[PDB]
């Protein structure tokens, strides 16, 4: 009874909230410049807060400055001094976000992108300008012109690529993630610290963290705070009236209605925070291979053209030529945009997972996320749709003899804990019987006798205010009943009938629980039990399915019984009908009389009954065979092996902590979800990669083209034509994305490790590349002309080479998929209507040299398609192991079976420890 | 008595009925269109569908609609309402069966086939027109017309390809299955629910599926029926008054007699079905691989002549005569008629099966039942003659005092269990003694010890009426009677004799039983034994030997002890005379005392007495070394392990939920019937191999041959007689079929795992191709010319063409067999009339310019040799290893004896585990 009135009262806040990604569009339109009536140096900025943070109170000539006090003394008595009441305008929400926004500062930076790469080439073109003007008398009739125009289509490209990702961020604006209550619907509900803008009513309890600074209303009776993270000591502090919450700890002491005053930069905590944060270094994995590949292209890029400059003396050319030559290799080469496309990619992508009821933040985490190999799921509320709730207690008969009652009522205890309509079911069964009442929420408990292993049970000794004693127990079904007494004698009949109910119970599910009541644990008195099951659901059925066919090994956690938990694991598809023992299914048990379980856990998926500092080992020794990890925090005692893992997946319903020590947050609190993530990520990855084989591979071939000439051939590479090619090849193209809906059938990656472009990608650039760049010198480097002057050569040299590149930006859809044409719209859209430049540039301006254009055309088709074939083929891939290494599979058999056996043999005796023992 | 006289009379129907493959005929011959009045849209069909189960009842204006009621309501009180009355007019048969037929939708997809390969050539041959209509002017006359000509000729196989087997699907309408009883003969018949026309007198039983919508005319006292797949609510529905069965399930309530109203897409349970069918996707393994080739074929085809294009503009040809040679070499390259050749191979390999009192459904089964490895097979009905009958009883003297006729009449048990002529022999044996009566119908049993390894036996508490008391035993002859005492003391004799007979019996098989008969089992009393053998037969005999011959592993299941089983097993050839105890003909028994049998049981055949929950393992452990299986029914406990299998082979005078978790039936309820299947599924194969490499082989020289042209050579390849050969080679000849004889000599292939067009295969075809390819060039182009015009070259570059191919198409033949010429009776057939063509082709039009005639025909049969025999040599094969290989073989020796030794020692033991514990 009072009990829960008191925790129905408390709580309920059905939808997070609707709020649309609207907001931020508003919001971005305007964000990081325009009012803020103060541009001093950077320098004084930094040191305001440092001296903002405590010290003595100078004249701003502005309203704000109350957060100061509050790291820089008590702030206890002067809280109530201050003062409370403030509120937003809808207009301050939208500027604090801007400046504080998620009241904890991160650091953006730049590895050197921008600068080595970024206004690098800049100057490039700015003193190609300067040659061009420098060459007074120059016979070069507009090159100044073209290059300049060129170089403006380069950094067309440049601005673009770094616009778009500043406008994301305002868009992220306004979200829903944890920590902060406020009132707005009928009911308090919860919001993002960033969101709770001034005004809105919040709520902090015992153990919670100050979201924002709020101006204390009023509640319970001391409101106690640590505000040791800002100021110093320790010591709680007593807020009286009108308080303040800045940040601090809520030392589990009282709880407090607020308004929210303060909620950004002029954040209390968010003072002695985001104003204040002076560097360091730390790169991810894949960005390390990712820089070393640039630096990889870099040498290569510069070199090979290099040579296609002093190479060339023989094909006759003025050193200066081929200087040129060089240099135009170095810039078609350098693969551009790779920070601006990968960041769009991130921010992006990181979107969609928030857009799907599973909030993600920090864009450093995707990486890693797509990489997951394992996922270790919590059952109740994630993997099935039923909570850890038992509906199903059942007891025999009846007697009523007083603490008959009393053992049914108190020992229908469980396993997990918290409340749910599990219990409530026991308090209307209670009813169903007399109609007294509280029995169900009550009792008076004090000492807790720790479920040891032997006895195999759990117990509490209470005692109630006038009475006799008594001591309920829980615990595997099995063992409890083996003791059992009861009022009337432990007939056979009630017996035997009990175990098989359970047993029917527990082979399709059923989560069986075992109740007595002694008061030491000796007695025996079976009250009933208390089984559970659950309906998996839609995308959970599924999402575990396409685990399986990405590799992705999924373990689930529960309180159930092995029994049980085998039945779960066999019906969502996990461990498939197959009774195990093994592992698959059945798993193991985190059990005493089954301690040697440790083999069983890792059973690879399945644990169930499992306790505190052994997350830490479990986590140590998985990492030691190089498995990943998705983890679902808990409590305290799962804290380290948290820490060791990667990846922490939070519950939204659930502790913020966790959401912390982990990368992404689960609000759908499906499992189904994980799966689609892990589906995403795997896809951002491959497109990835068939981006930079499009590139690459295509921009390689220009890279020897332009030394084939330069020792032979005849024509030339001019501004015009060239930088054509360049604005459609270099641009968009490289950029483009699109997820790949079967890479779900490729196993993880592996990061760190694993090298960046991979040497097969490696192969598959050379392999496309190397053809068009032949099919090129053949292309009409046999054809047919009748007079020798490029007439024919150029007006397909570059409308080939358009055309081609065009063929490789289409070996570039999903990595993963394999002969896919007319996919990507836009990129299909793109490449129509880059065609038709091509076909305007050849057609009239060049309408009377057209020689080429009858039977060179058709050529380009019949050819502008092995391109396509022979990424089909790269796609489909098939390892060839000699006879031998399979032979060495046919031993395995037995020792594997040999294996098997024993661990049963073990895991058999397991079964019945006591039983064993006692015969012993 | 009164048990039997209950049996004979609801049984009976000797003769499924010889109902020919006629009235298939006329009614396909009118199945798809024609009259039904009513040609909405598709999307109004399946919303009607939807609208029509359950909903309200709107006006139609016409007679039907009574079957929604069904599963829209319960129908309980209303079914008597809709009312009954109602047959067919043959007429409704002909049409509801080609709307619903069999009572099951089924899901016939295209993968792509008619699509991307079928009309996607069309187009082709049309554009083909457009360019000779585009070319107003052109100097080629008539090459229009002649495009046009040959695409015409395509077609025409491209329709006649794709019509046989709609028609073939409409004569599989009205043949017999399971599932329904009627009234025809002078007693109640068994036919297929599709056969099964509105009108015969259909018998609903206990457990039994109502196979149609049928109203009900009368029977038992209460019919209880679950209407749960229709509507809703488990409860039982009580039928009333002509009733009415839809498709529920009878829950083993009452028995009903009714007519069939209903039969088909008007249905019950067959419009709750048959008109709704949402999509999805799955596709079968040899599929994939057929499907994959297909690729490497597009592809292979689609540049290699691609090439013969470009690189011959050296050929002084322009790109244009190099590209109608690339898109030529297509055409003849595109190994059309896949879809349509294995589709008549499998709809008419599937009639010949259901011809042969062996019915196989769903032609997705043909595929893994041809590489069936493994066949389990039960005794008693499928493998022998006699079933499960013991016409051997014996008892010794007599003694006639009362109890000793209770256990000599209760306690001749056996081992399967259902009746038989068996038992009434012992019913005749009884009146032999006194003249009394019953004893052997009767008794009240409600007791039953479960049979217990110690012992070694079953038994049963029985209580007459009024009587002392009686417990009657069965199991295995020494445990047994190494208790009995009986009536007169157990003499030396009695035993010693006792025990000799039932060896004479079992050592030429006999099913020796022990009865004896106490009250707990302890006590002994001897009554006799009835043990059994089985003449086995015709074909299973012979079949046997086939499947040692195929490789195929056939494995015995029956009710008989081990000592019988292996005489059984060695009896019709399964392990010949030699007297195991290994595995081969002995095998094991899933006996108690014998426990280890787990290891004889998988003795590689040979299984007697085995239980329950073990099905499952043993399924799962045979599966684990790669082993297919092709099993057979029978019980619950057996239910896993079929599921797990791949396979399942139900008897046509057995179970429908069998028949369901399987793949085909068996009607001819012989062993030797399935050695035959075995046997046509290999040639299914081979056949479809020979004719792969045929169109293969053959069409690569082509592919090439037009390149060689296109580099030199001189003539040329045009519309006319090119034409010809494309219509004379491509067409039926790559299609035709034939049965391999041999073929049985052949190991089974694997599917899944194996790669399609073997290796070896594909260099079969380049072999047999690179030679007539190269005989080609060198078949004239050295020969002898007088003035460089072709006018022999011609005459005899298409001769040997068009005789060649002919050549391949017969080393098409079996591709099991090697060395056979003048086989496929058709084939040859063409082959003649196909030479004709090319004869009159050369003759007259030519008959001037013939020079090659005389001296080049002659050297083409003396090649056209030489593809025969170099197929013959292919067709024989043989393995080399390196000494070294079979010498660890030499090794082996010993180890297997030692192993073999061991197995036997242990197996000792369990000859006899009672003494040797009694000893311990």
Redesign the interface.
């Given at each position: 009874m009072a009990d829960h009135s008191a925790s129905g009262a408390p709580a309920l806040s059905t939808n997070i909230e609707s709020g649309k990604f609207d907001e931020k569009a508003a919001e971005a339109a305007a964000y990081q410049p325009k009012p803020k009536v103060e541009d001093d140096e950077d320098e004084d900025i930094d040191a305001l807060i440092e001296d903002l943070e405590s010290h003595d109170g100078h004249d701003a000539e502005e309203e704000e400055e109350e957060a100061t006090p509050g790291g820089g003394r008590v702030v206890p008595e002067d809280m109530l001094q201050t003062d409370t009441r403030v509120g937003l305008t809808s207009e301050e929400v939208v500027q604090r976000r801007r400046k504080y926004g998620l009241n904890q500062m991160k650091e953006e930076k730049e590895n050197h992108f921008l600068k080595f790469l970024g206004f690098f080439v800049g100057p490039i073109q700015f003193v190609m300008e300067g040659a061009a003007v420098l060459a007074a008398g120059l016979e070069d009739w507009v090159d100044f012109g073209v290059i300049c125009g060129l170089l403006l289509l380069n950094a067309v490209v440049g601005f673009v690529q770094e616009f778009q990702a500043g406008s994301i961020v305002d868009e992220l604006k306004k979200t829903l993630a944890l920590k902060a209550v406020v009132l707005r619907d009928g009911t308090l509900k919860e919001i993002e610290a960033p969101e709770v803008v001034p005004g809105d009513i919040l709520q902090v309890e015992e153990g919670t963290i100050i979201p924002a600074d709020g101006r204390i209303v009023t509640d319970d009776a001391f409101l106690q705070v640590d505000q040791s993270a800002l100021t110093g000591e320790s010591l709680a502090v007593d807020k009286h009236k009108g308080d303040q919450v800045f940040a601090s700890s809520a030392v589990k002491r009282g709880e407090a209605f607020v308004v929210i005053t303060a909620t950004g930069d002029n954040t209390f905590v968010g003072r002695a925070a985001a104003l204040v944060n002076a560097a360091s270094g730390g790169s991810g994995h894949f960005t390390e291979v990712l820089n070393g590949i640039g630096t990889i292209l870099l040498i290569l890029v510069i070199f090979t053209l290099l040579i296609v400059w002093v190479s060339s003396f023989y094909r006759s050319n003025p050193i200066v030529q081929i200087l040129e030559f060089t240099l135009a290799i170095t810039i078609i080469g350098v693969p551009v945009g790779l920070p601006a496309v990968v960041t769009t990619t991130m921010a992006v992508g990181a979107a969609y997972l928030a857009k799907k009821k599973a909030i993600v933040q920090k864009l450093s985490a995707i990486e890693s996320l797509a990489g997951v190999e394992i996922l270790c799921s919590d059952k109740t509320g994630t993997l099935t749709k039923n909570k850890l709730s038992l509906h199903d207690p059942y007891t025999v008969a009846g007697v009523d003899p007083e603490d008959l009652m009393l053992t049914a009522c108190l020992a229908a205890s469980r396993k997990k804990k918290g409340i749910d309509a599990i219990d409530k079911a026991f308090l209307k069964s209670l009813k169903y019987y007399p109609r007294a009442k509280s029995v169900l929420s009550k009792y008076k408990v004090l000492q807790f006798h720790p479920f040891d292993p032997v006895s195999k049970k759990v117990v509490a000794v209470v005692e109630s205010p006038q009475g006799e004693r008594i001591t309920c127990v829980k615990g595997a079904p099995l063992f409890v009943l083996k003791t059992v007494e009861e009022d009337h004698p432990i007939p056979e009949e009630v017996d035997q009938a009990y175990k098989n109910k359970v047993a029917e119970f527990a082979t399709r599910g059923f989560r069986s629980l075992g109740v007595a009541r002694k008061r030491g644990e000796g007695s025996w008195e079976i009250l009933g039990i208390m089984p559970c099951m659950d309906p998996p659901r839609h995308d959970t059925y599924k999402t575990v399915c396409e685990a399986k066919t990405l590799g992705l090994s999924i373990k689930m956690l529960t309180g159930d019984a092995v029994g049980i938990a085998r039945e779960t694991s066999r019906q969502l598809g996990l461990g498939t009908?197959?009774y195990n023992a093994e592992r698959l299914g059945l798993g193991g048990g985190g059990d005493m009389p089954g301690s040697e379980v440790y083999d069983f856990v890792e059973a690879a998926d399945g644990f169930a009954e499992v306790f505190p500092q052994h997350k830490y080992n479990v986590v140590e020794i998985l990492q030691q065979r190089g498995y990943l990890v998705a983890m679902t925090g808990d409590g305290v005692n799962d804290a380290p092996s948290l820490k060791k893992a990667d990846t922490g997946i939070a519950v939204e319903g659930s502790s913020d902590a966790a959401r912390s020590a982990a990368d992404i947050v689960f609000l759908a609190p499906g499992l189904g979800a994980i799966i689609d993530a892990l589906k995403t990520s795997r896809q951002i990855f491959h497109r990835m990669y068939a981006y930079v084989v499009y590139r690459i591979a295509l921009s390689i071939h220009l890279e020897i083209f332009l030394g084939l000439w330069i020792a032979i051939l005849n024509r030339s590479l001019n501004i015009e034509l060239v930088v054509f090619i360049a604005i459609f090849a270099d641009v968009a193209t490289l950029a483009i994305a699109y997820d790949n809906a079967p890479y779900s059938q490729t196993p993880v990656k592996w990061n760190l490790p694993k090298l960046w472009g991979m040497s097969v990608l490696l192969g598959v650039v050379l392999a496309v590349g190397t053809w068009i760049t032949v099919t090129t010198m053949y292309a009409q480097g046999?054809?047919?002309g009748i007079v020798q002057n490029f007439g024919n050569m150029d007006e397909v040299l570059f409308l080939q080479i358009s055309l081609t590149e065009n063929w490789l930006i289409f070996i570039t859809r999903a990595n993963g998929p394999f002969?896919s044409s007319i996919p990507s719209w836009q990129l299909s859209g793109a490449i129509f209507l880059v065609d038709i430049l091509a076909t305007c540039f050849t057609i009239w301006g060049w309408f009377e040299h057209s020689d080429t254009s009858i039977?060179?055309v058709?050529?380009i088709w019949?050819?502008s398609?092995?391109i396509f074939?022979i990424m089909?083929?790269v796609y489909y891939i098939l390892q060839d192991s000699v006879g031998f290494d399979n032979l060495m599979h046919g031993k395995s058999?037995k020792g594997n079976?040999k294996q098997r056996s024993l661990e049963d043999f073990v895991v058999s005796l397991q079964r019945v420890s006591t039983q064993h023992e006692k015969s012993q």
């Open positions: 009908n197959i046999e054809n047919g002969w039977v060179a058709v050529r019949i050819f398609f092995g074939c089909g083929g058999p079976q």
